[PDB]
Amino acid sequence: MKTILSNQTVDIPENVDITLKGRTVIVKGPRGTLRRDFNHINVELSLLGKKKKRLRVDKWWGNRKELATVRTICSHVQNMIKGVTLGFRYKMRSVYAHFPINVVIQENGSLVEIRNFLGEKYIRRVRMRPGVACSVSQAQKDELILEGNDIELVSNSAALIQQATTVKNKDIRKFLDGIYVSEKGTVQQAD
Amino acid sequence: QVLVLDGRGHLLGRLAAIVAKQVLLGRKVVVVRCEGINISGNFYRNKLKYLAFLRKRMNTNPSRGPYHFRAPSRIFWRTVRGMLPHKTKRGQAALDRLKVFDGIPPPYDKKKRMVVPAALKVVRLKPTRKFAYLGRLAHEVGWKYQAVTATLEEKRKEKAKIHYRKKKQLMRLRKQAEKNVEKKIDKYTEVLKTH
């Protein structure tokens, strides 16, 4: 109903350097650099504080619909800060029945190659996003590790695995089988 | 004379209602960069609508039917057809003044290119509304020269920057010639009547 301004408080830790050149937020920290395009919303992002690094998100008029975005912007900034000081780690335990799933990762963590999936002789090769890596969890039964800096590209890479493994033309109440995401954690664990 | 209009971000209809009037009067208007002309509305509805135009053909012979053009310069030329009395020798001479070029020909590289402020996406839309590019639409439906335009348009944009950087050098020369004086005697008159 054209409410006046609502704002959000984003406090920034000392690990990183943040920089906006418009509505293009550059966040540069210990686990590399990162930058995402907030250039499509009409929301003013400004920052303040000598070394104390306070970033305010601001929208003046808007709607119930338009004042909804001002927190999504606030929350997508959040996950970069988790994703640049720590990184994300996804633990994907491979659930299977009788038929054994054997997994290798093909070349340096890009391609993931799935063999003998449920008696599918079809080689099931799913490639990963630019900026993400894969691993097999050692001392651990058939659980998979994906790490990155951005929660889209990590979880897009996890999603491409768990939909390429789909039990088709049979009952899904039986055959509960495939690679599935378990825990959504950080690279530098529990910190 | 020669209304060399740009195509950066005009809306289709809002530009169309102004060109059709200004070409019935004799003023030759040449619309350049016709690929980047926006359409207000969804990205999916417009390729839903223009696809629905592609079904509109004649059963018994589709050769004698609605000639569906695909290039965005020709999409706009057929738009202006709807706004003229095209079946009369009042509009039939009118379309022969309107020339349209998707991308920029060599005569019209260098003549200055006007912009209608009344027909821009900047003005005419509440900015949260969505939008679609007629070049984006035309490559997706039939037209095959989006890549060939993209090569040639970078070829002039790279060629334009080396000139404006060289012309901005020239303008720095004359303001150093401003700062050298024996001209304020003439500038007494100039300042008292609109510097």
Binding site: - | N59, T60, N61, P62, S63, A71, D102, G103, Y145, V148, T149, T151, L152
Partner: protein, 345 residues
């Protein structure tokens, strides 16, 4: 309505405008895409459909019943004498397509090409390409002759090569050449252009471009039959014995209210002499012809790895309605588009 026995539709609505073509040397509507990796090579040829023979073939196809056995097949023979490269044409990628930038010919152009340009060779005074030969000769005319090649490197993106079949090594009556254009799919534009300049006025072999069991497509123009009726053209069904006004017609051309004959309604279009591109016909063999008198005259053709006999190219008594093969023949699989003595590509 609702025919009560629904059928698939007769004829091709894709091959619809069944016109006798305005050329019968079949042009190439779309060459393969050029590619920066692979070395400089041509993409097209000409031939003359000589005739057909069998081939008894050892078959190695694991997983079929045919394997390790011997098969008779229907096999054509296309005589392909060597092409002579004459010209070089440049093409600019524009927003209207490939604009022919300019052409550069060679100098001592053979008279079979000069017979291509005129209509009456006997009437004419042979005066085509006299003052163009002078452009090579004049040494201050050279500078704007090879300024072409500077532009041809620079702005031309696709280079296509003009070449013709020799006619003095054929049993054909016509003695006129067939000019072409052959796109070169080499790397950068410079080495496409320099390999072409390297080999103007040279007898480009057939075997240098093609290769055995490279599965290769044929563009040619079909047989000519003339204005034939419906049931022989479109293979629609004959009306029965009892029908007044005949048997070979179509009974219902349209409905009432679409008051117009549709362009799908089967009607007497002229059979044959159209243009076709048949795809995926495997070359078996390329065999040379008639070496000089060290061996005093070797024929030794159709002399494969299990026969070792003095056999000819042509059958005993020659190919019917062709003549006699004395050139490099490309021995193709299956029935090929065109009559005997038809120019193929």
């Amino acid at each position: 309505s609702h025919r009560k026995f629904s059928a698939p539709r007769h004829g091709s609505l894709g091959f619809l405008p069944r016109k006798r073509s305005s050329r019968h040397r079949g042009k190439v509507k779309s060459f393969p895409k050029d590619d920066p990796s692979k070395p400089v090579h041509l993409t097209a040829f000409l031939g003359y459909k000589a005739g057909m023979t069998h081939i008894v073939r050892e078959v190695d196809r694991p997983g079929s019943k045919v394997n390790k056995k011997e098969v008779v097949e229907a096999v054509t023979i296309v005589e392909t004498p060597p092409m002579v490269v004459v010209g070089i044409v440049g093409y600019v990628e524009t927003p209207r397509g490939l604009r022919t930038f300019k052409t550069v010919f060679a100098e001592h152009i053979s008279d079979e090409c000069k017979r291509r340009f005129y209509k009456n060779w006997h009437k004419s005074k042979k005066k085509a390409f006299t003052k163009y030969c002078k452009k090579w000769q004049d040494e201050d005319g050279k500078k704007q002759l090879e300024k072409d090649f500077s532009s041809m490197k620079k702005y031309c993106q696709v280079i296509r090569v003009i070449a013709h079949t020799q006619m003095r090594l054929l049993p054909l009556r016509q003695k006129k050449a067939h000019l072409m254009e052959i796109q070169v799919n080499g790397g950068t534009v410079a080495e496409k252009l320099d390999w072409a300049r390297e080999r103007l006025e040279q007898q480009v072999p057939v075997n240098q471009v093609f290769g055995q069991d490279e599965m290769i497509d044929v563009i040619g123009v079909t047989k000519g039959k003339g204005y034939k009726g419906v049931t022989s053209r479109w293979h629609t069904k004959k009306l029965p014995r009892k029908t007044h006004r005949g048997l070979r017609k179509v009974a219902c051309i349209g409905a009432w209210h679409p008051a117009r004959v549709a362009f799908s309604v089967a009607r007497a279009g002229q059979k044959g002499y159209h243009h076709r591109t048949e795809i995926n016909k495997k070359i078996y063999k390329i065999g040379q012809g008639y070496l000089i008198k060290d061996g005093k005259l070797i024929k030794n053709n159709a002399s494969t790895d299990y026969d070792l006999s003095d056999k000819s190219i042509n059958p005993l008594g020659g190919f019917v309605h062709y003549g006699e093969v004395t050139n490099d023949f490309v021995m193709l699989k299956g029935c090929v588009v065109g009559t005997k003595k038809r120019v193929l590509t």
